[PDB]
Amino acid sequence: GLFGAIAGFIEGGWQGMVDGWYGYHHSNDQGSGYAADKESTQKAIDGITNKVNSVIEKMNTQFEAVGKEFNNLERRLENLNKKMEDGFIDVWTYNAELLVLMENERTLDFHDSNVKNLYDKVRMQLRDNAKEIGNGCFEFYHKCDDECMNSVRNGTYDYIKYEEESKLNRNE
Amino acid sequence: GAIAGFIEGGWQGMVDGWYGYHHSNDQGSGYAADKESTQKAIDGITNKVNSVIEKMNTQFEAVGKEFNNLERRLENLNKKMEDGFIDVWTYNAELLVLMENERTLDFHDSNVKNLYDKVRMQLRDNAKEIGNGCFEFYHKCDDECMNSVRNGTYDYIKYEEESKLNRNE
Amino acid sequence: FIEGGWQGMVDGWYGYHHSNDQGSGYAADKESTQKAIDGITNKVNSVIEKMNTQFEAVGKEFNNLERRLENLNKKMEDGFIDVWTYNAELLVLMENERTLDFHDSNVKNLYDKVRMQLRDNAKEIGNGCFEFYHKCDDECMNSVRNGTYDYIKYEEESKLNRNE
Amino acid sequence: SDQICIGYHANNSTEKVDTILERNVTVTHAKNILEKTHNGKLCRLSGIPPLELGDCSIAGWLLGNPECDRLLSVPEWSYIVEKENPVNGLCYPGSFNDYEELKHLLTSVTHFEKVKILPRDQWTQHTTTGGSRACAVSGNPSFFRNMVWLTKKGSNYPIAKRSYNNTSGEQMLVIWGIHHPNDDAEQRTLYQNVGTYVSVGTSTLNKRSIPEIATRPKVNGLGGRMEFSWTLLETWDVINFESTGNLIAPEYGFKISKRGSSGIMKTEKILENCETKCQTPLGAINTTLPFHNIHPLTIGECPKYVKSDRLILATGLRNVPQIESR
Amino acid sequence: SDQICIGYHANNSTEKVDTILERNVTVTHAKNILEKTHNGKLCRLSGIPPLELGDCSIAGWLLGNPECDRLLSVPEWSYIVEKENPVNGLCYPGSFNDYEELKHLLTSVTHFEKVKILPRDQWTQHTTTGGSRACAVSGNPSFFRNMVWLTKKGSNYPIAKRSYNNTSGEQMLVIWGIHHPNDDAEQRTLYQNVGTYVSVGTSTLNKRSIPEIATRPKVNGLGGRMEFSWTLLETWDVINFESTGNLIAPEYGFKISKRGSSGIMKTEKILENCETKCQTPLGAINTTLPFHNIHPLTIGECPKYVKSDRLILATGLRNVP
Amino acid sequence: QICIGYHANNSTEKVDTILERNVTVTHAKNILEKTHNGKLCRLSGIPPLELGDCSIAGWLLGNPECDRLLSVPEWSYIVEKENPVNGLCYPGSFNDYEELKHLLTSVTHFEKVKILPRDQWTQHTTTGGSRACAVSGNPSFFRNMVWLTKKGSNYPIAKRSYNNTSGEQMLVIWGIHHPNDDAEQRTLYQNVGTYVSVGTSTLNKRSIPEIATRPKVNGLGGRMEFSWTLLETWDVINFESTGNLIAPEYGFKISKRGSSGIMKTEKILENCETKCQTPLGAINTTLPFHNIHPLTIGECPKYVKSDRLILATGLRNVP
């Protein structure tokens, strides 16, 4: 807006990044826009897809036909059978609930760390050439157009190139 | 003098909460909890504990059953069932606890690490990162300023100036 | 750590590679490796300390007039197998996820254990290595490995080399 | 003043999940793994329609209660649908030995062929027309269609003696009964002798029943009782009947004509024109999810029933959007 | 020379937990989730006290064994407490058909009302005073209080024929027996005829028993046996007895007067004045925890029994001074 | 320069995780036992009771074709064929048979005691037998049973008891012969409308022969319905019969107790040892799961329906 770009991983999510799950927002003379990290997003989608299939590759092979019938002289037997059917439902119901609960905890942390990695993947490859703002964004000490923007996104950023004037701008 | 951070160990002297700060200035020294960080955890952990306890439970069930001397297979059947469930519950319980304790302790380690980075990021060049989980200021900071670093309203642009002059020797 | 593993480090699990005038070589962190081996050994024993105490003798026999009873028994034996089989599979799956992350974080810690104790005396390359701004021989190398590194010592000339 | 920023996706998802640490957490995406809906309709399983008994019960059907004449011939079945308390069972009051073991036998069989094994025309020394008002077909005393009530022919009940080699090439259910009269007068009226027996022999079966003549409450306006029994005659095995009175003999057996996977489900729903791999008393389940909470008594390839109201896996990010117009 | 430090809480907690990776790890706080203690006392469940049989057994009680006369009338019950091998069951030796099915029937019922359905005064063609030394009430031959031993009245046992329409408005347990004498002499002494029967009819029940007269070892000093049977007479249904000898007929039925949730637990503990939602043979459990390890054979709303000695969740920090 | 890295090797071994599949790791621990020795073995030192073609009923009745089992030592568990050939040579049934069979999944040794010697039925012929129980061409009968029949036109009441003074609990078996017709019933026992009563302190049976025509099994139409009981120590068992009694000569004192089971297999015993036996072979393992065979006997890992369970112990192998 209307309020000055800048939301990073810290501060929140971006509705404007319809592209993928994790990604970059940029700001230069040419303009501003959102862009997903295809690599980071994919590794996650795969991870999460697998997580979901893991829970769903299960047992399942029936037919089983659960209904059973008993005399009025076989109440202990009926009851036995009832405790069994109940016992299994109790187990499956508890494991399921807790499984879901633990795997949701893990999933969200998984996302938080993927995004943090994307941050450090950049931080490490820029260093003194850029100021770490602290909102999950980097202010450049030099200039960087779309040619250079690709380089920082897909990890081919030339630090030795912009090494020079980054220093001169930094020292005031 | 002082200094134990997250690295190095715990502070008995912080009876206040779970995670927090120790400070050292001209006025003095003291411990102080991060109410925000501690709470988020207490809540998390309380929930963890309730999750494990919201369960099944609704009996009456009355487990004892009785059988003839001509119903030994039936008795035995029933025994294998009661045993089978106990084996399942007992194993799941033990392992559940085991995995959730692993997770809890890591949870605490990362909360404290966050509290560290929450500060580090908001101070930067104004302070020297000692490496024991403490920051030595390159400038000066009294209790007014101490509140600001704790509750995240620290003025970096303020002490920006003399931090530099002290740093360069 | 970034970039990959080292076959040349037959020594332990996590460790250091160094490069100075004397030479180059690999060296494990006995401390970091051990804490892990112990952890992982425990993980494996935790899963294996179980139930187990039979005799149980699972085979049971029934009339042609006790088919419901036979079937009951079959659904029980099947039910338990279904439970154990599912829990086992998922247990293994979750604990492997955890183990690999465990390794990644141990190695990351070893990185930060160094980074924090060196700071301006060294340039963080970004591939998980530190280029020194000063010089460091095997005497000094021990110090950085086992955490007794003298920052206040090499503090001086690190600065002069850094500023151009 | 040039800038790069690293962030994550958000959307207008309203969907909440729980975690071990946190509750009602809004996320961008979620996968429900708990099947909650059914179609409301009673359906065919693996193409086959189920055997739908209406008001009849298995005993009514296999004995050939008159009110069950619509089931004198019925095709292959997926599973059996029975009412919880069917109206037409034993028209003539009695009991059925090992009834539930029989009922369980039909949760694997999926088709009978009813073979006439002991035609009634060949009891030429006995009256076979016996019947009663409890089994009345429009006002007139009748009896179970598949059974024969032997009684004295003009002041004599000679020993009744017939066998049957199961040459049908498949295994065969044979049923029979013994009549337990209400008093000695009735026992003579019908069978002339007193102290009578019904023996049945196969290679493995050996029963011998004596009528228990006792006074007892009128069920369906009758005091007598008929206690039915059954057996599986194996292929090429023979079954012998021998009786000096009180035999309710079969005219038909039931060759177990198709095998497979069925069950009995108790419901008052009528069959409809739909398909499933999983049927429940409330309706059928179309799902790929691992759990359902619809109804424990399923038949077919079903998800694991659980007693849970919600199981939702987070797949997406923690949905924490941008303050618009940002 | 001014400093800020970020750290965590420690205390004098000694409490250890285990994790997948680590063992005996001291933590600042922990929540035990495994209930280990019981009060030691046998208690009332949901306010009601349980039916406490002492040395009697269900068969002793329902037949009305004389040594069980303290149970001729007993109020509503939470659950049933029985000894593992009760002394007073079938005073007159015999058996009880479908006994465990009957016992199981009382793990849902919680009160009887004993209704006099066939008063003995109305067997006016038979002697009803039969009894024996095995059921002796202080030296004198007696018999099961709720049963009647029909025998010949002066050289005759006419057909014994009585019915009973269950008009009690609730479902009713009726029990009866057949006497299996030791030899033909005894069978005549008592019932005149030989080759006798006892038939019992309801709308759904149809039994007919013949006495098996055989020589056999003396149990309680007796060679005869009495085989008892039972049935649930449904409301408004009738039960007919017909016998030409060997009938042990009921005087009473047992209207199932209260329904609900009970069980039978085998223990020698006596009831005491306390309360629970969960009772075990060793004592009762007051707990909110999900697991216990006290005893598998509980009755009530109980945590899941496990075979474990400790389950402790870390809630606190790793306690490291 | 200093660099921080991790171990790699030429490991090929793959594991799966919740997030990832077929991930190569440096080290892994299989926790799923997959192998057995192929051999049928002794459990806790003891060898199992190995019936060959005989069945428990053949053995305890003393079917002639089972004469190799007239005396057999203590046993770990019982090995029986799935459909043993020699059971009831003379066709019939065995009341509460599976309950009896189950009784031998806790007992581990019998001693066969002669409780009612046949020499003492001196008012009856004891030599009765048939071609269904033929020992090389000649009609015989179950070795441990005695077929009482009339001695020259008379079957006086047959009346014998036995106080169990063996000091241990004792299995006693008996039968009632159900002839094919009235002619046979008289040929053998004279009288018609007969009984066999058996009394102990807790047992009270009385059986009448059901004389009916029926299909020939083993070329015979008669049937013999066997029953059994545990005579408790110092208790007495009374037999009384006016015809149709198949009386025991022997009882079976339950001589050793413990832990056995019955496993159905055609494998022969061999000279090896285990704490866990299955129909395919035995299991030597410390792992918690196996997938060999559900029907084990002994202290075994939990059977699972799984093809692989492998815990990663090592690093992600990325060389």
Ligand SMILES: *[C@@H]1O[C@H](CO)[C@@H](O)[C@H](O)[C@H]1NC(C)=O
């Ligand atoms: C932050 O909030 C106020 C600032 O007005 C201060 O009084 C308080 O002590 C601070 N809290 C913490 C935990 O530092």
Ligand SMILES: *[C@@H]1O[C@H](CO)[C@@H](O)[C@H](O)[C@H]1NC(C)=O
């Ligand atoms: C907002 O959500 C609605 C449904 O709740 C959906 O139809 C719509 O596509 C969403 N908006 C955007 C921009 O995706």
Ligand SMILES: *[C@@H]1O[C@H](CO)[C@@H](O)[C@H](O)[C@H]1NC(C)=O
């Ligand atoms: C979460 O939401 C549901 C309804 O959507 C509500 O009933 C429940 O009380 C909430 N739970 C918590 C822990 O706030």
Ligand SMILES: *[C@@H]1O[C@H](CO)[C@@H](O)[C@H](O)[C@H]1NC(C)=O
């Ligand atoms: C029944 O018939 C088959 C051939 O159909 C024959 O082999 C057999 O002898 C007969 N069985 C009996 C028991 O008579």
Ligand SMILES: *[C@@H]1O[C@H](CO)[C@@H](O)[C@H](O)[C@H]1NC(C)=O
């Ligand atoms: C089941 O669901 C699938 C969803 O892909 C649908 O296409 C199919 O028609 C459904 N079957 C029935 C009977 O509704």
Ligand SMILES: *[C@@H]1O[C@H](CO)[C@@H](O)[C@H](O)[C@H]1NC(C)=O
């Ligand atoms: C140890 O801790 C407890 C509080 O949990 C306290 O009561 C006790 O006095 C403490 N002792 C010391 C020396 O701090």
Ligand SMILES: *[C@@H]1O[C@H](CO)[C@@H](O)[C@H](O)[C@H]1NC(C)=O
């Ligand atoms: C844990 O502590 C207990 C003492 O309570 C001891 O018996 C056990 O061996 C300990 N285990 C370890 C790994 O220290």
Ligand SMILES: *[C@@H]1O[C@H](CO)[C@@H](O)[C@H](O)[C@H]1NC(C)=O
């Ligand atoms: C029993 O009594 C009721 C009336 O009190 C009557 O309706 C019913 O017909 C009687 N039942 C029988 C089985 O006679």
Ligand SMILES: *[C@@H]1O[C@H](CO)[C@@H](O)[C@H](O)[C@H]1NC(C)=O
């Ligand atoms: C069995 O033997 C002993 C004699 O040694 C005797 O005391 C006991 O009473 C006998 N029991 C019976 C039932 O005969």
Ligand SMILES: *[C@@H]1O[C@H](CO)[C@@H](O)[C@H](O)[C@H]1NC(C)=O
């Ligand atoms: C199992 O195998 C190991 C050697 O691999 C051996 O030491 C152990 O004694 C074996 N046990 C048996 C019962 O064969």
Ligand SMILES: *[C@H]1O[C@H](CO)[C@@H](O)[C@H](O)[C@H]1NC(C)=O
């Ligand atoms: C694989 O590692 C082995 C260690 O067993 C080592 O000897 C060898 O160098 C490796 N393979 C190759 C081709 O280097």
